[PDB]
Amino acid sequence: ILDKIFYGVLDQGNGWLYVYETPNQDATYDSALELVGQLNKVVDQLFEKAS
Amino acid sequence: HEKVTIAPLVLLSALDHYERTQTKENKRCVGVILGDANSSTIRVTNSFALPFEEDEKNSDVWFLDHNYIENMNEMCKKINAKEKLIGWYHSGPKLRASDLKINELFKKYTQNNPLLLIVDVKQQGVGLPTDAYVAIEQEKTFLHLPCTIEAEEAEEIGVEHLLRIRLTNQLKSLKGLQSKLKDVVEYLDKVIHTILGKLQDVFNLNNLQKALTVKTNDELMVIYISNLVRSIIAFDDLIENKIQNKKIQEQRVKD
Amino acid sequence: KTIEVTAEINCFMHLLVQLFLWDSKELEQLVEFNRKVVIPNLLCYYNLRSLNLINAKLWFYIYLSHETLARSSEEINSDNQNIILRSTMMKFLKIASLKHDNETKAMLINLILRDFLNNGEVDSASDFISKLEYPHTDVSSSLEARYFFYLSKINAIQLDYSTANEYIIAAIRKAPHNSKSLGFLQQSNKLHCCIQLLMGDIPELSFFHQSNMQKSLLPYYHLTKAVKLGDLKKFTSTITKYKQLLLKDDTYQLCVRLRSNVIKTGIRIISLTYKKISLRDICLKLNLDSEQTVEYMVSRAIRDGVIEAKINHEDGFIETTELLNIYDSEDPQQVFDERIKFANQLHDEYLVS
Amino acid sequence: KDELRLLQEPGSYVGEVIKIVSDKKVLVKVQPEGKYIVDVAKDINVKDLKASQRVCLRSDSYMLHKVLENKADPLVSLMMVEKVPDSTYDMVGGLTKQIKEIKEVIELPVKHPELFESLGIAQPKGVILYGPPGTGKTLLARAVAHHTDCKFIRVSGAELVQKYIGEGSRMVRELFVMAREHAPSIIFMDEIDSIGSTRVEGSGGGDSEVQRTMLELLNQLDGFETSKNIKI
Amino acid sequence: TKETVYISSIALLKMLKHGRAGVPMEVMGLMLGEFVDDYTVNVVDVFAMPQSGTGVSVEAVDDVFQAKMMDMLKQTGRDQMVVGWYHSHPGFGCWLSSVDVNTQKSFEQLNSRAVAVVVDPIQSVKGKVVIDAFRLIDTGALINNLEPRQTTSNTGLLNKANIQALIHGLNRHYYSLNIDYHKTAKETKMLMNLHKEQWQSGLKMYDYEEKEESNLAATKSMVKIAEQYSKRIEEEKELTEEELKTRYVGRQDPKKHLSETADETLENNIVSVLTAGVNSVAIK
Amino acid sequence: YFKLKKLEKEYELLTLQEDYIKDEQRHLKRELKRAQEEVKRIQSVPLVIGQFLEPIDQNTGIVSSTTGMSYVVRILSTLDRELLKPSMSVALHRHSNALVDILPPDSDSSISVMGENEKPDVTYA
Q: Where is the PCI domain (chain C)?
């Protein structure tokens, strides 16, 4: 499971099993990567133009 | 099913015969549409009027010349060969008893199901100044086909040269329930169920969306995630322009 | 007579530089001499080009030296020159027409607020805040950080760290001058960290390590581990040794407020994650201080907004919650209006640009 | 809005001024069409018109519009002039006899043209390489136009000749026009090369059409034009 | 003043419908109405004629077909005075119809003020709607009101006017066509509300709701790529310039790439907000 | 006092001017949107292919049409230097004869075709 072969999680206390769907994420945060890279560069570039 | 496509050339042509003939409310200008009814898309590329006379005292009295009907349809074949008799159009806001008796005239020379069109010069209420209906029997049964308008390239562009949202959508949506409420009350006292059965089918089909309400709010947040990122991009240009505006002011002080 | 008075003041402001930290003349005759050269209509009728020509920035650090162990020396109740000064100060604002007054309005309030910080009552200072708030466009960048410094300190005594948060942010970003970045910034950074003391976060030393000397780093480092680990013994020994630094900054009040935060912060540090927490496990944790206070200690921390729990006296446990949920309908919509409100501060950039 | 009105144009051809007419007209040869007598612009005097001057002729009224920059726009097959040639004589180095023969022929008149005129012998305008195939001469070809600071030009006689009407002449004459303005350059003659760099063993059956043109332009360039510093 | 032709709503649309058959071929028609010089000029009704084997000439018009059709104009209220003959031609640089010569000279005998209209673009359509005409002058037509002063006449700077194959003579004498339009209160009320883009109208809510929402999943992924190429342009923009001068032929460098990161961002966010307000609007 | 009353009337006329500037600001965007829609309708499905040769000046260019002739077009304001290719296949307008778009690097033609495989089913080894 940790090798991304089988998808699921077990239960040690009661000896049970739980359901885990195959996709863990859609495409959302990939757009935030473009925002973090912009605010860590263009923002620092603004002071170079002012100073 | 089939759909009715009315070109802007036909809609504007029917409005001209009304003013030139000085037609009052006592008369209704009748005309003949021309097009191809064979396929599912019914397009009308030509229209012309006819010397029609209306009598309000007797609905069975109408004056129509069949000689001008066949002659003009034959003489206009030289322009385009795709123009045949698919039906006819007439004026007036309402359908009187004289309109039902004139439906069987053009059916002799018409192969497929004829098409009826009602031109309204006033255009009072909602949309669709021109409504299209089909005449078919099993008792006359009329069905309203979807009315669309599509023209050629030079015809659609020529309109833009002569002319050189959310609030309106909510106003007409509210009036739909007010007009439907009056139709049910008037029909209730008229009988004292078949007509109301069709309206009940649409009216019945957070009531049913309660199961999807939880999943709807989760999708609205993802939409705001994109809007929040685009808003920050627009905010960076404001600071960039503010610094850029100072560079112009710095040149004015030295020079 | 505007030019004649201004020409005489030009020679007066040059002497005031000597009267400030340089040459104090006499500690008696000078304070009486500086009063008679101001009152006789130097501010006049507000004719034209009248500002910055009064005392203003110069007299902040002057009169505080004459009041302490100079003219008074605790031989009287208050300086008679300061009593007349409070009469002239509050008369300057009473005769103000609120037209071109921007920088001169905020500087005089700095005296009545600073006086309440040492000897006086700060409850009456809240009434001056309604009058103090104005969109001052003439305040220089050096005094913009000081104007935000006093507004954040008054709210600290009023037990509100939320309002004082917005003022202290813009205070450390301003005043680029070297003297303001050494003595004024180190004193302001300790007040900025004081807001974190009442909040319960108390972040580690990253930017503040090289920004200030080791004088302010020693007490903050000992208070960081004392409040986080929830140890009142180490917290008590810190107040005793550092008492000399706590009195000059008026931070001695942390022996009560911050002491109560030692328990509140230690709640989130220790793991309450499990549901039913027995009474004996609570007594063992947090040394022996949590043994005497068990049910009452958790009762107030829940209403204050720290955690959310439930106490059961029948079986002798306490049901606790870590505040963990999943966004479904109304959960993600709580921050929806907040993120829009966060952008409202950036919506003013359209008029600025 | 002012740009939208400028974007509407009937079009303008491209031609070159031939002569000047006393009738306030001009004879301009339109390359895609031919020689047409047109009108000179009213804002441009007829005295500024020179020979083979690149100008702009309107399509609608067939007359001169304005005067563009003077250049011959090349039709590009293999003949595009490159920039920043990358090579050196240290990479193909190690041959003592070949370098001495190249310098005394190509590089010698370029640096010191007065040595040939003072001695009384004409400077060599061309050379033919000899040797076995694949000696590494492909890399040194870039260094010939590099160290001499000349224009890098390669000529393919096959791609400049077409069976279409007028396409087997104007292409060849295009090389002669730019060779005068680019004159500090060395022209490379390919498709005849047996040296082994690119070895087709020459073409004697495909050059029958171009021999009536290219052979006349190469001989007239040296004899009639007397333009030096041009290496064929 | 002169006669300024005012094209009605139906007058412009029928001219494109009559010449609809073939690019090279040609048709004709008759303009109608009554008008007086010094303002009024109007064309009430237009109708075409069958294409003959002679193209457009004096023998092209059929008096038999015209007389049989003219009797139908009276009963329908369509009967008016004939003000001219409009044609359709592929068009040339000058003398757009090579087969049309002796027509207008025979037309000016009946009425000297009659004109002839030809649709210029015929597959060249642009959207400025450039239409052409011709009217003969020869001897006379002078000692009258001012023809040129009306609209942008008294020209000939260089040779440039219109098609620029004309200069002075055009066809003959530079009739200087003037093309305007006038409509009644009922005709103007139509095309304003009727013609917008396409017909979803009367309810905008659910028509494009399902179509736009179904592609919103793909739209979310496509707008992310546009932002990826946004900052990469501005990053390389300030990295290569240590000067702040122009050797760079960069006369306006920033505003182009700044607007590409702004207007595109301004386009993508508004379509995800204004449409999102009506994307649900469920209430109960 | 006469000059002081005259200065008051000067700013009263500017009061209506401030609100009127915002009226033209929202009205110009409606006319600016119509100008942007006109630019989008120029290209459309009708476009001719040509060969770009060398740039000259802004809103000016020298190209070679595929009809056998050569014309001088006007380059768009978008393409200037970095986005402008020295020699590539580009799109041109038919009647207006202006620059449209840079065509993709298509080297294929009707004569002497070049085949290209797409999703081969041959398995290695």
A: 145-325
Kindly determine whether residue F78 and residue E256, on different chains, have CB atoms separated by under 8 Å: yes
Q: Do E173 and E253 lie in a common domain?
A: no
Together in a domain, E211 and E143: no
Residue E60 falls inside a structural domain: yes
In degrees, rounded to 5, the angle at the alpha carbon of residue E185 between the alpha carbons of residues E182 and E186 is 110
Domain that holds residue E56: 2-181
Number of structural domains found in chain E: 2
H runs (alpha helix) in B76-152: 97-101
Residue E177 sits in the same domain as residue E239: no
Give the span between the Cα atoms of E276 and E216, in whole angstroms. 11
Q: Is the domain of E223 the same as that of E156? A: no
| Residue given tokens 């778009």 in the structure block | F101
Partner residue facing A50 (CB), from B222, B236, B243: B243
Specify the 3-state DSSP secondary structure of E179.
strand
* Residue where a domain stops, chosen among E147, E181, E215: E181
- The answer on E240 and E132 residing in a single domain is no
Q: Which two tokens stand for residue A10?
A: 């077990």
Q: Are residues E26 and E156 in the same domain?
A: yes
Residues E5/E176, Cβ–Cβ less than 8 Å: no
Helices C232-241 and C214-229: crossing angle in degrees, nearest 10, is: 160
Is C209 exposed, middle or buried (CB count within 10 Å of its CB: 0-12, 13-18, 19+)? exposed
E194 inside domain: no
Ordered alpha helix ranges (H), chain D: 2-6, 96-102, 108-111, 114-119, 137-147, 170-181, 214-220
**Within-domain flag for E245:** yes
Residue E192 falls within a domain, yes or no? no
Q: Which chain E residue has its CA at the smallest distance from A32's CA?
A: E224
Q: Per the CB < 8 Å rule, is A34 touching E234?
A: no
Structure-solving method: cryo-EM
Please give the C-alpha separations between residue E43 and each of E17, E89, E127, E145, in angstroms, as whole numbers.
17, 20, 22, 22
* Nearest residue to E94 via CA among E23, E167, E147: E167
E87 is in an annotated binding site: yes
Supply F33's token pair: 């949107």
Helices (H), chain E: 9-18, 63-75, 102-110, 185-194, 209-214, 216-239, 254-270, 274-279
Q: Quote the CA–CA distance of E47 and E108 in Å, as a whole number.
A: 20
Whether residue C289 contacts residue C329, with contact meaning beta carbons closer than 8 Å, is answered with no
For B64, the token pair is: 């129509």
Q: Note whether E68 and E165 are same-domain residues.
A: yes
User: Whole-angstrom Cα distance, residue E66 to residue E161?
Assistant: 37
Question: Do E13 and E152 belong together in one domain?
Answer: yes
Residue B95: which CATH number?
A: 3.40.140.10
How far is B221 from chain C, CA to nearest CA, in Å? 7
**What is the distance between the alpha carbons of residues C137 and B108, in angstroms, rounded to a whole number?**
88
Instruction: Residue D66: list chain E partners with CB under 8 A.
Output: none
Contact C333 B217 (CB under 8 A): yes
In angstroms, the CA D142 to CA D87 distance is 6
CA distance B221 to B171: 28
Distance CA B114, CA B137 (A): 12
Q: Tokens 């002169």 sit at which residue?
A: E2
* D151-155 β-sheet, strand order: D151-155, D185-189, D230-231
Domain span at residue B21? Answer: 1-164
Contacts of B75 (CB under 8 A, 6+ apart): E50, E65, E69
Query: Residue C134: what residue type?
Result: Y
Name the residue type at position D169. S
Who among C333, C339, C346 is closest to B235 (CB)? C346
3-state helix, strand, coil in chain A (%, to 5): 35, 10, 55
**What is the distance between the terminal CA atoms of chain F, rounded to a whole angstrom?**
104
* Cβ-defined contact of F53 to D13 (cutoff 8 Å): no
Please indicate if the annotation marks D10 as binding a ligand: no
Measured CA to CA, the distance from residue E121 to residue F94 in angstroms comes to: 12
